[PDB]
Amino acid sequence: GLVPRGSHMQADILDGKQKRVNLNSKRLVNCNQVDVNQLVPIKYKWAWEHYLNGCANNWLPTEIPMGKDIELWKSDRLSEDERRVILLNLGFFSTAESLVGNNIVLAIFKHVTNPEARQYLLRQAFEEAVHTHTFLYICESLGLDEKEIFNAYNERAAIKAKDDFQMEITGKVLDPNFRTDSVEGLQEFVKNLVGYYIIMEGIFFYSGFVMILSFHRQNKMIGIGEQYQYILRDETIHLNFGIDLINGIKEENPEIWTPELQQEIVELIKRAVDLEIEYAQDCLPRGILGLRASMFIDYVQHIADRRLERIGLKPIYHTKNPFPWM
Amino acid sequence: SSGLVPRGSHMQADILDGKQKRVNLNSKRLVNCNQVDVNQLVPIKYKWAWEHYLNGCANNWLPTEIPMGKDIELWKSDRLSEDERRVILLNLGFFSTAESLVGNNIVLAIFKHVTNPEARQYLLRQAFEEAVHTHTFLYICESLGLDEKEIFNAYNERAAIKAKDDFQMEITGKVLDPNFRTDSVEGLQEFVKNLVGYYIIMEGIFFYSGFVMILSFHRQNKMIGIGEQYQYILRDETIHLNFGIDLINGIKEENPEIWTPELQQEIVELIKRAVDLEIEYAQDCLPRGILGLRASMFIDYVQHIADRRLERIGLKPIYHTKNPFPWMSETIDL
Ligand SMILES: [Fe+3]
Numbered sequence: 260g261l262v263p264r265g266s267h268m269q270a271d272i273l274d275g276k277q278k279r280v281n282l283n284s285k286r287l288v289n290c291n292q293v294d295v296n297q298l299v300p301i302k303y304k305w306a307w308e309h310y311l312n313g314c315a316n317n318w319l320p321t322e323i324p325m326g327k328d329i330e331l332w333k334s335d336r337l338s339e340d341e342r343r344v345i346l347l348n349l350g351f352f353s354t355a356e357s358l359v360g361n362n363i364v365l366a367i368f369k370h371v372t373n374p375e376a377r378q379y380l381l382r383q384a385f386e387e388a389v390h391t392h393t394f395l396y397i398c399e400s401l402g403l404d405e406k407e408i409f410n411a412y413n414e415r416a417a418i419k420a421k422d423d424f425q426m427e428i429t430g431k432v433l434d435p436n437f438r439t440d441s442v443e444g445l446q447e448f449v450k451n452l453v454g455y456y457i458i459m460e461g462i463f464f465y466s467g468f469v470m471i472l473s474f475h476r477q478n479k480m481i482g483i484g485e486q487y488q489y490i491l492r493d494e495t496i497h498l499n500f501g502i503d504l505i506n507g508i509k510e511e512n513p514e515i516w517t518p519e520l521q522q523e524i525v526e527l528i529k530r531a532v533d534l535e536i537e538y539a540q541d542c543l544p545r546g547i548l549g550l551r552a553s554m555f556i557d558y559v560q561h562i563a564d565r566r567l568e569r570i571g572l573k574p575i576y577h578t579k580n581p582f583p584w585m
Numbered sequence: 586s587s588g589l590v591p592r593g594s595h596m597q598a599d600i601l602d603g604k605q606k607r608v609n610l611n612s613k614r615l616v617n618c619n620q621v622d623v624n625q626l627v628p629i630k631y632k633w634a635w636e637h638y639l640n641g642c643a644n645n646w647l648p649t650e651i652p653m654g655k656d657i658e659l660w661k662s663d664r665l666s667e668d669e670r671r672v673i674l675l676n677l678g679f680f681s682t683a684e685s686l687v688g689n690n691i692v693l694a695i696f697k698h699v700t701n702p703e704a705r706q707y708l709l710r711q712a713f714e715e716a717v718h719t720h721t722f723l724y725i726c727e728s729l730g731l732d733e734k735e736i737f738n739a740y741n742e743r744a745a746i747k748a749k750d751d752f753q754m755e756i757t758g759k760v761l762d763p764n765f766r767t768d769s770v771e772g773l774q775e776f777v778k779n780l781v782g783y784y785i786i787m788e789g790i791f792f793y794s795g796f797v798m799i800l801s802f803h804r805q806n807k808m809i810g811i812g813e814q815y816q817y818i819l820r821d822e823t824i825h826l827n828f829g830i831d832l833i834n835g836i837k838e839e840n841p842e843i844w845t846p847e848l849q850q851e852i853v854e855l856i857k858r859a860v861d862l863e864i865e866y867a868q869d870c871l872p873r874g875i876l877g878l879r880a881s882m883f884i885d886y887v888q889h890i891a892d893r894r895l896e897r898i899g900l901k902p903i904y905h906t907k908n909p910f911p912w913m914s915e916t917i918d919l
């Protein structure tokens with residue numbers, strides 16, 4: 260344990276060593292006693308681990324060949340019903356990624372007063388930018404009208420309904436006067452986390468994944484499928500991180516987790532399930548090979564139950580998973 | 586993709602007025618853009634921002650990919666002098682928190698006000714890159730068995746480092762006020778001063794004496810693991826600087842009324858002060874010479890790069906010094 264002479268930096272500000280961070284004073288929220296700019300010592304090892312795992316998942320949409328997809332798309336082989344599924348899913352995802360990434364930067368990051376958790380957030384937000392690039396790349400490859408696809412959430416009622424709900428559940432977190440140092444403020448902040456991690460990423464996105472990955476399984480639009488596989492790998496970590504963050508904030512601030520807040524979260528999850536079912540019905544008015552809307556009634560309920568359990572809430576639907584392969 | 590558009594390949598609107606929200610390319614602006622929907626990436630207007638984003642994405646690296654065995658062997662040996670160790674430690678000290686300062690300013694100050702989705706795409710890449718740089722300094726500390734708390738706290742313990750970061754805080758301005766807005770001449774000028782403080786001064790000047798000293802070791806075959814990590818950080822920082830210059834010049838072009846003789850002078854004076862603090866930091870790092878490095882060389886170098894930064898944002902060079910380190914403009918193959 261011996262090191263050469265001169266391997267330490269000498270301080271010349273004599274009071275400065277007091278600013279070294281005490282690991283145990285670190286908190287996920289409302290932490291202003293210690294220096295948020297120093298990463299070390301890392302307290303939340305789960306956050307750092309998610310960061311490292313995310314970094315190991317580097318990919319770019321432009322690495323994925325689209326030749327076979329373009330050839331299929333331009334042919335007469337796809338039914339109009341199949342094209343409808345693809346188009347509605349591209350319309351929803353094209354802007355939803357932006358909504359998620361903007362909320363991380365503009366709502367979440369300020370109030371997560373912890374450097375290792377913020378490291379992960381920076382990785383997550385970049386990953387949402389990659390997902391956006393994906394949708395641009397798909398549109399350009401297939402020769403879709405990119406404005407028509409990206410504007411879908413303003414033109415298609417079942418998509419608009421999901422993102423209008425998302426706006427509601429975002430709450431007042433963007434307001435200049437919003438703070439998390441009240442019980443009510445921190446409850447609102449947690450509802451925003453549930454809205455984006457549990458509902459948007461954890462329910463809305465997983466349902467679109469099934470539709471697209473169902474094509475991939477049939478050897479149709481395999482390039483889009485492969486991109487969605489990479490997106491799913493990322494979203495798995497986004498969800499695990501968000502659940503950890505929610506559970507961590509609960510643990511450190513047990514006064515927020517009232518029966519009232521719990522019921523409010525349950526009610527928002529129910530509303531999200533109903534919207535996602537409506538969206539699946541809009542995607543599948545008749546149903547295509549391997550996919551019918553009735554399967555989504557079961558699937559959306561099933562995943563909602565899994566998300567509820569992860570944040571300490573009772574399952575409510577008790578439906579089986581009709582897509583075991585997911 | 587040049588084949589016929591097939592029947593049924595359009596998605597039908599069931600909200601008839603919704604088409605009005607498709608974004609007109611000519612309505613997009615870098616700041617104060619409330620006329621169009623910021624959540625839609627397309628159509629891309631600022632091709633330069635998108636190019637920076639694609640270039641950054643092509644530069645993926647991780648500090649953990651760079652072997653540290655030879656550096657550990659050298660650090661543990663008597664073949665590195667006390668003065669050489671001081672250069673390494675002060676630079677690690679400064680960089681370890683500077684990356685977090687830059688990244689936090691991107692997210693908390695810049696992103697809100699850059700009202701354009703392609704520029705925001707680049708910002709998210711840049712902020713992630715700053716996290717990679719932070720990881721790099723943790724990895725170096727752990728690799729060499731340095732006291733991580735000592736290194737990351739350097740900016741509170743060393744006067745020449747604190748002086749730089751205190752200046753940085755000042756030049757951040759009032760942009761963090763949650764009621765700060767860029768929708769006035771004064772507001773937009775303050776925002777542009779923040780961009781100058783972070784892109785031109787922090788990233789474009791304060792990082793450079795450090796890059797020279799560390800890359801000088803790498804050229805001598807000393808601490809080549811740290812050197813390689815600094816080469817990757819340099820490649821990133823070059824793109825960060827180019828983007829910030831492009832953004833400052835684009836904001837000026839779109840809002841020429843902000844670029845007054847008074848603002849121009851204020852910017853020059855900020856850059857002059859940054860030069861003085863950076864020269865003082867180089868003197869702190871180098872009380873005595875090491876091979877190919879002396880504190881006095883940094884007077885010329887820091888002034889030379891400050892002139893180059895000034896020119897790029899349309900201001901006249903003021904120092905006219907030559908570059909003592911012309912190898913720094915040598916294409917590195919990574
Ligand atoms: Fe996500």
Ligand SMILES: [Fe+3]
Pocket residue numbers: 687715788821822825
């Ligand atoms: Fe940078």
Ligand SMILES: [Mn+2]
Pocket residue numbers: 356359386387390490494
């Ligand atoms: Mn995503």
Ligand SMILES: [Mn+2]
Pocket residue numbers: 684687714715718818822
């Ligand atoms: Mn950096």
